[PDB]
Amino acid sequence: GQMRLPSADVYRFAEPDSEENIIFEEGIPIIKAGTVIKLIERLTYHMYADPNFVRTFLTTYRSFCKPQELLSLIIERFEIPEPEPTEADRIAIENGDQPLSAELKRFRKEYIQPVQLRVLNVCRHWVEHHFYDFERDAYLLQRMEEFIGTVRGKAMKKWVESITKIIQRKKIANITFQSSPPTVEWHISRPGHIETFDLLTLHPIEIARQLTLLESDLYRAVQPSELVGSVWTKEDKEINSPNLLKMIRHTTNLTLWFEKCIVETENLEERVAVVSRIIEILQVFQELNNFNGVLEVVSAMNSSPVYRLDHTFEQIPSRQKKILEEAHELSEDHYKKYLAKLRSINPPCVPFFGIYLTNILKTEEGNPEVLKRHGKELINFSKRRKVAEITGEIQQYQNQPYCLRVESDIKRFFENLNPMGNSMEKEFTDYLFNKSLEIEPRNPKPLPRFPKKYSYPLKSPGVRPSNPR
Amino acid sequence: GMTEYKLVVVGAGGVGKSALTIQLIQNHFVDEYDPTIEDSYRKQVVIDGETCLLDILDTAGQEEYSAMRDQYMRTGEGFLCVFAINNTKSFEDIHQYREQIKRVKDSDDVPMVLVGNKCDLAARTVESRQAQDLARSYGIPYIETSAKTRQGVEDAFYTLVREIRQH
Amino acid sequence: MTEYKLVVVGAGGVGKSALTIQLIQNHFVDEYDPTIEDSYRKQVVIDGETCLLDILDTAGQEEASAMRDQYMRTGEGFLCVFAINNTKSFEDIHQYREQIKRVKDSDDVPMVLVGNKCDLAARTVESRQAQDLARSYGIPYIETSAKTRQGVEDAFYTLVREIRQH
Ligand SMILES: Nc1nc2c(ncn2[C@@H]2O[C@H](COP(=O)(O)OP(=O)(O)NP(=O)(O)O)[C@@H](O)[C@H]2O)c(=O)[nH]1
Numbered sequence A: 001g002q003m004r005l006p007s008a009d010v011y012r013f014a015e016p017d018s019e020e021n022i023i024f025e026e027g028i029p030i031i032k033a034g035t036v037i038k039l040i041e042r043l044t045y046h047m048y049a050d051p052n053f054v055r056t057f058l059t060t061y062r063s064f065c066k067p068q069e070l071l072s073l074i075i076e077r078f079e080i081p082e083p084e085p086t087e088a089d090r091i092a093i094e095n096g097d098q099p100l101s102a103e104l105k106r107f108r109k110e111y112i113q114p115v116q117l118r119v120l121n122v123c124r125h126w127v128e129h130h131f132y133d134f135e136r137d138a139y140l141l142q143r144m145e146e147f148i149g150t151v152r153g154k155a156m157k158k159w160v161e162s163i164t165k166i167i168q169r170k171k172i173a174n175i176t177f178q179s180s181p182p183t184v185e186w187h188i189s190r191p192g193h194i195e196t197f198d199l200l201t202l203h204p205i206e207i208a209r210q211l212t213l214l215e216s217d218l219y220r221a222v223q224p225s226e227l228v229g230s231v232w233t234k235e236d237k238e239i240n241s242p243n244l245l246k247m248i249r250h251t252t253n254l255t256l257w258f259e260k261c262i263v264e265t266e267n268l269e270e271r272v273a274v275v276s277r278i279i280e281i282l283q284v285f286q287e288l289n290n291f292n293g294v295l296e297v298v299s300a301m302n303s304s305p306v307y308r309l310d311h312t313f314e315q316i317p318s319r320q321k322k323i324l325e326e327a328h329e330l331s332e333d334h335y336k337k338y339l340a341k342l343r344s345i346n347p348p349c350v351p352f353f354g355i356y357l358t359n360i361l362k363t364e365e366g367n368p369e370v371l372k373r374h375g376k377e378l379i380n381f382s383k384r385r386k387v388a389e390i391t392g393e394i395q396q397y398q399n400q401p402y403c404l405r406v407e408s409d410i411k412r413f414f415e416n417l418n419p420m421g422n423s424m425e426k427e428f429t430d431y432l433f434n435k436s437l438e439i440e441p442r443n444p445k446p447l448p449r450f451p452k453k454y455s456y457p458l459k460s461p462g463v464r465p466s467n468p469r
Numbered sequence B: 001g002m003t004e005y006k007l008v009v010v011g012a013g014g015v016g017k018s019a020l021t022i023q024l025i026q027n028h029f030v031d032e033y034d035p036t037i038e039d040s041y042r043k044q045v046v047i048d049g050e051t052c053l054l055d056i057l058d059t060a061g062q063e064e065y066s067a068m069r070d071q072y073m074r075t076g077e078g079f080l081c082v083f084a085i086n087n088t089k090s091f092e093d094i095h096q097y098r099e100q101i102k103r104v105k106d107s108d109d110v111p112m113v114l115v116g117n118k119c120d121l122a123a124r125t126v127e128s129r130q131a132q133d134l135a136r137s138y139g140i141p142y143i144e145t146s147a148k149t150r151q152g153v154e155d156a157f158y159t160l161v162r163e164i165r166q167h
Numbered sequence C: 001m002t003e004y005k006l007v008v009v010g011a012g013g014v015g016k017s018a019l020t021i022q023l024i025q026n027h028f029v030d031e032y033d034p035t036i037e038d039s040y041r042k043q044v045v046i047d048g049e050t051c052l053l054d055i056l057d058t059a060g061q062e063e064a065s066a067m068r069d070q071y072m073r074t075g076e077g078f079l080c081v082f083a084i085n086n087t088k089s090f091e092d093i094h095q096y097r098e099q100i101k102r103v104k105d106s107d108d109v110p111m112v113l114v115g116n117k118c119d120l121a122a123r124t125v126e127s128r129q130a131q132d133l134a135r136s137y138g139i140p141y142i143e144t145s146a147k148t149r150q151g152v153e154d155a156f157y158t159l160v161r162e163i164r165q166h
């Protein structure tokens, strides 16, 4: 038979499942909704582990339970009463013999020890992967240290001592590869001559590599805490989502820099060379699976100042038109081809973050926080699972590092890129559009001629890499 | 067969803009949504007895990618310009959204509707007369919608389709 | 994209977590933090086909020994890990092999025998002894180092191939 349980009056997590406290989706069960007590019971269930659920719960729980209350509840879960001696044990003791304690030993082995270990696994995951709760609430951290530091008894000792050390390390807080990274490539600008760095003087291969390292680092820095609760859209977004916003502002700045490079090149022949070079950088972004970089270029070519430049577009070589068209088509039909490509490539990659943001926001906005059933309000956990499926996909692509060497001067050049200067956005984008009208006026105005601005060769070195001994 | 209309929702973030398309495309009567579901932004409807397919682009949440607005707007034939009736800044943003649409479409007469969205019970700060006056100065319809009761949602999209049909 | 459920099992301290984190993050973990149960995901192209690996990293400490049936039921293939400088961990392999076969009620479960810590000179389990055991199970034997990455992709991706052809 099943093990008997403590009375639900002394241990709340022994209440029977019912539709008034838990609802399952239609081989472990998947929870659609439940009370917080039932969610925590199943988070730490005696029959099976559910590591995905631990991640989902710890990522999303603050929309229905405060961190201080979660700790109180899992401590309550941990403190399981042991059953009293049975009739057979009683009779043995009355005769001066040692009882077999069969039911007690089974309850310890099959209920208490698994539940307690799974509570500690929640604590371990909480500290290792969601430590911001403790950074933001020093008293919560004190409570966790005290709880872990006072767990007695030998069955849990190895993990209690380990978790104590993990907490202490987190308070005060290296890559190996299958091969060597390729050699850094140089064109007109030579190493150390940062004052000459520009779109056409750096090597297009190395522009794409160094932007990919920068954009990969920005992608990898975004934590789920910046996404849950749609906080990057709210009034405190600069406080709650700083790494995400830094990532987006880089993408915006690079798109605007590409546009500025194009329209400030007034001579048609030179402007064709600029556009061709940007499409070569796009080709290397594609080769590196840097889809953020691909879309930086695609957004620039779709912008009002650039898209209208028919005389420039006409002179783009056919093979480069085909590269740009293929990249543009990734975005068509609500990013259908992009989504299929992301799911087919071999990482490392840099995803485009915008689709994730829209899907998290719409999942939050389009589903209710609670479900009402039999007069009770149950937490709608299916909604949180859907959000955590998206944050889990994000995290999966944050693991793989690029085997590319940083060039510190090229990195600093792109870190400090500031195409808008001190201008406000409307000011600056109006300037770009008026430049576009100057260099290629609306028909039937005649096309003017403009002097060259570049004194160095415009011929591209191409984007196939070189390899000396 | 049937005509497909490519519609684009634009407007300030953080003030419930996404509720407009969610409530439309939703199972009207079950309050649930998976936006990742291929063609959860397509809906077949009958407007004035003529069946058509709506394809709605709402990039809610991507507002900080400001240099992508041209790309997204370029996909559309008609536009819903949305502000929140309790956020005056979102209302003041409308002029620049409309100017940007006109530039992207290279036309002074782009089918569009102005939508005032009631996203919560916080106090209204944009009166309907102010929004009607703005819409009239542009020559476009004004529709008010609730982000919670679905009121006005069908009217906003069907009015825009009528603007496209009568362009 | 096919999904594959891999489970990493073996005695405490043999390097199950270090192997998994080397595969996932290209990082070697120096600390010895005993695992309760962890799970990782990895998209990777293997023999020209994209798949999604779900990797369950399990507890080797004996105090968790009564909690294994639940993860053995879900797993589609098993990395059976011992350390080549720890003869007791090698003797523990057969207990994992027998429990997996019982739980899954099958003589034909995808498995790979992994001898980890092969960067260390002071070996106490000879390759021949491990290879003999692997042949008796019908499975390959791969020596690995979570520290240097030697053999790590080979071990995990060989297991994928055995699930794929199961
Ligand atoms: N030299 C060397 N040390 C290794 C290697 N793999 C793991 N270690 C070290 O061995 C120790 C235990 O590693 P760990 O991955 O935690 O082992 P585990 O099998 O996951 N232990 P548990 O079963 O308790 O979760 C750590 O100090 C780790 O750095 C290896 O290939 N070489």
Ligand SMILES: C[C@@H](Nc1nc(Nc2ccc(F)c(Cl)c2)nc2c(C3=CCNCC3)cccc12)C1CC1
Residues within 6 Å of the ligand: A275, A298, A301, A302, A306, A307, A308, A309, A310, A312, A313, A321, A324, A325, A328
């Ligand atoms: C592949 C590319 N497609 C198109 N691009 C561009 N232009 C353009 C693109 C890149 C440039 F570097 C410059 Cl300079 C220009 N115009 C187009 C037009 C026209 C617009 C306005 N007049 C009529 C003709 C029509 C159909 C497609 C395009 C897409 C990324 C955007």
Ligand SMILES: [Mg+2]
Residues within 6 Å of the ligand: C016, C017, C018, C033, C034, C035, C057, C058, C060
């Ligand atoms: Mg481990």
Ligand code: NA
Residues within 6 Å of the ligand: B086, B087, B088, B089, B125
């Ligand atoms: Na206001």
